Amino acid sequence: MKRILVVDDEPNIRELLKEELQEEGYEIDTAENGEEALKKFFSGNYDLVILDIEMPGISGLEVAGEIRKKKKDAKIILLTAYSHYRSDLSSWAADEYVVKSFNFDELKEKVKKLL
Ligand code: BEF
Ligand SMILES: [Mg+2]
């Protein structure tokens, strides 16, 4: 069994992502903000973290930087509604960048790839 930490500030989106990823057979934990994400991540044992960018408090780009620095071999996907941040220097902390779609096939392919 693989475990994924799903981080997004929007509760209905956390719910949707958790359902979609459970369907693929993963065990899913969630966090509602970056600060919570970092606490769960460093205290836990996740195979992959999926990180929203826009959140109240520290951004997912900031979270990605911290995880990359303190867990060199982490698997990190930025999953954001917005294509804006793709060219952002800070995105280089992530293994993949995915713009949220209502067709989850792309996200699932990238998750499968990283695991
Ligand atoms: F709020 Be996330 F960047 F879609
Ligand atoms: Mg958000």
Pick from 65, 36, 46, 60: which is nearest to 114 by CA? 46
Resolution in A: 1.7
Q: Structure tokens of 32? A: 């509602």
Please tell me the distance between residue 69's alpha carbon and the centre of ligand 2 in angstroms. 23
* 29 marked among binding-site residues: no
Pick from 96, 113, 111: which is nearest to 27 by CA? 111
Q: Where are the alpha helices (DSSP H) in 6-104?
A: 11-23, 34-43, 60-70
Residues with Cβ within 8 Å of residue 98, at least 6 apart in sequence:
77, 78, 79, 80, 106, 107, 110
- CA separation (Å) from 51 to 89, 95, 110? 16, 11, 13
Read off the DSSP letter of residue 59: -
Q: Considering its fold, how many domains does the chain have in total?
A: 1
Distance CA 92, CA 3 (A): 23
Domain that includes residue 9, residue range: 1-115
The burial class, CB within 10 Å (0-12 / 13-18 / 19+), for 47 is middle
* 52 marked among binding-site residues: yes
Q: Is 29 helix (H, G, I), strand (E, B) or coil?
A: strand
Distance CA 2, CA 27 (A): 6
Token pair 């982490």 in the structure block, residue: 74
Q: Could you list which residues have their CB under 5 Å from ion ligand 2?
A: 9, 52, 54
For position 75, which CATH number holds? 3.40.50.2300
Token pair 């993949």 in the structure block, residue: 96
Please tell me the distance between residue 98's alpha carbon and the centre of ligand 1 in angstroms. 11
Read off the DSSP letter of residue 45: -
The burial class, CB within 10 Å (0-12 / 13-18 / 19+), for 37 is buried
* 54 marked among binding-site residues: yes
Nearest-ligand number for the alpha carbon of 33: 2
